[PDB]
Amino acid sequence: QFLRTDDEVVLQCSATVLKEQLKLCLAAEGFGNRLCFLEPTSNAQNVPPDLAICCFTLEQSLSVRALQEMLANGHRTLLYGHAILLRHAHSRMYLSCLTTSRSMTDKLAFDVGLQEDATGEACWWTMHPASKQRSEGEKVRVGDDLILVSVSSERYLHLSTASGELQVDASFMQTLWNMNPICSCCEEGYVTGGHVLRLFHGHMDECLTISAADSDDQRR
């Protein structure tokens, strides 16, 4: 129905390449690569997309003045104009914006990255409605279109395509991001999708498995 705090969601952008629409999500592995990249999810019928690292979650939502007064020192509903604190679910690191240089565009790219930044200086975003139909202080309909702006650097998160592949940074213009409710507060003691878990067989001690390590069987 509507977005709430403590919910797990995924970003989504749509940019055509071969005169046909290709859905592109935002994800990063975590340990070993502080940068972030794009994962195509347009051929699910043949290409299995990797959604183990695409999951995000919403932890905080505050007004700009509340944020700025907190900087010196339940379950809410999102409204346009508030701030936000993204949080990568798997690696448990906060999405932010770094101050490095990439793509050599002689520009204001400031490529995106997530390190640890619980400290509130560059780890926050404010969201605005895209079209004139919506306005500030309005409840966020599921499946809307958002525009995200860095609180610190004040740059739109730009899907900056170039001569090479498609890259993400915050330099020049808007980027229409569509939200997606992966899941919500599930019920205890019930199986849900996206879990990692074991498969016992029989009564007491027996389970599914694969061949051991250091073998030429290629785990088949």
């Binding site: 520009k107 004040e154 213009m173």
Partner: protein
């Protein structure tokens, strides 16, 4: 020619007497950035700087 006249006005609304009054100055930069086309296309663009 036209640009050099509008900008000359803004110089008199950012300071009044020896580098002061920042409230209107603060909103000028936050507003000017919103329209990147305000910068001359020789720099601050996509082609080159």
């Amino acid at each position: 020619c036209g640009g050099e006249r509008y900008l000359d006005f803004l110089r008199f609304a950012v300071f009044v007497n020896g580098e002061s009054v920042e409230e209107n100055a603060n909103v000028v930069v936050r507003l000017l950035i919103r329209k990147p086309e305000c910068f001359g296309p020789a720099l601050r663009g996509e082609g080159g700087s």
